[PDB]
Design a protein around this ligand. Sequence first.
Ligand SMILES: [Ca+2]
Ligand SMILES: [Ca+2]
Ligand SMILES: [Ca+2]
Ligand SMILES: [Ca+2]
Ligand SMILES: [Ca+2]
Ligand SMILES: [Ca+2]
Ligand SMILES: [Ca+2]
Ligand SMILES: [Ca+2]
Ligand SMILES: [Ca+2]
Ligand SMILES: [Cl-]
Length: 368
Amino acid sequence: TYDFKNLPADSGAKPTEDQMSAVVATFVDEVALPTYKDMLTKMTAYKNAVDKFIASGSKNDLADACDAWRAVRVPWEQSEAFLFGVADLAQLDPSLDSWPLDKNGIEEIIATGEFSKISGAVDEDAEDGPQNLRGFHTAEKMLFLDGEPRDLETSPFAKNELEYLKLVSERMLSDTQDLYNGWLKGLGTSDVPSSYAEAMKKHDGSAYSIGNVYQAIELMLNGNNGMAGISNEVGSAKITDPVTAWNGSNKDATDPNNPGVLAVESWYSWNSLDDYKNNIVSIKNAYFGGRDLDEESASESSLHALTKMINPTLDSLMVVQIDKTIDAINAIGYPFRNNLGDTEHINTATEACADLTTGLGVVKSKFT
Ligand SMILES: [Ca+2]
Ligand SMILES: [Ca+2]
Ligand SMILES: [Ca+2]
Ligand SMILES: [Ca+2]
Ligand SMILES: [Ca+2]
Ligand SMILES: [Ca+2]
Ligand SMILES: [Ca+2]
Ligand SMILES: [Ca+2]
Ligand SMILES: [Ca+2]
Ligand SMILES: [Cl-]
């Protein structure tokens, strides 16, 4: 009979500052920095694989580049529960991963070779802002066709499009380096002067307005770019918005202008459901205090432990809900671009994200 809006009384135990500081430390050292390190390693393999393909024209090298694209995408999407800090401050989320794309501008660059248009600073209010001509999805669009490696004779590359692919992938690597370095040691720029990891571990107001340990925990849970942000975004935006478009449409998944299909992020490669699942794995890692950890393997310095201590029922409801949300995402028909009419499964999934969002709000309330 208990739910997130109808809880029993808290235990009365409140965590100490040293306890909360250890949760933040373990988050930074066992969730953030390793996710990003794994991303840098996988991004370097991805750029090397793309390069080897550009050099050869080999179908096997292409397949390998495609695999490498998917593999670097795991840790990136597993990092969306913590877009605060460098990802936010240095504009790297939109630089790396804008959707949708300015498809007319991409085609134009392929024709003219004006590659300078793709390497500028993020500018979110111009339609031809550079961010919308680069990133994961521009590479995707060139590597993949409806779920598969592109066919090199069915849809042949333009010479300029190959150079475009190389430039996009250089910049994907560069942004990833900046992300990991920004956390690890800082970039020495106006926006990211010093280590974000250190400013988070110290939480003493010396950098980035992280003023005390309560602010650091609130940051992890927050609704703009923390745990509640990504639960809410997966449910209300990534899943809901393409379904809304589909419902207003002709409901023909084979029509290249179907607005539902076109709104599905990673439909080129059919990576959408893996993305959404990985976004909730990001929450799960965050809550249990390590990559791929769960309740039965959780760190003692985790949000899980502190919530359990404050209210066992709320924690227990959170344990169930993280797993219910992942299971609901996984039960949606694959690929998502052909199953936008899979109503029952989609609804369980969007209701489960909406409930994980409420739950994370309640957890956050125990620290403000
Ligand atoms: Ca994304
Ligand atoms: Ca995004
Ligand atoms: Ca967008
Ligand atoms: Ca502007
Ligand atoms: Ca097929
Ligand atoms: Ca094929
Ligand atoms: Ca062929
Ligand atoms: Ca603050
Ligand atoms: Ca929405
Ligand atoms: Cl999919």
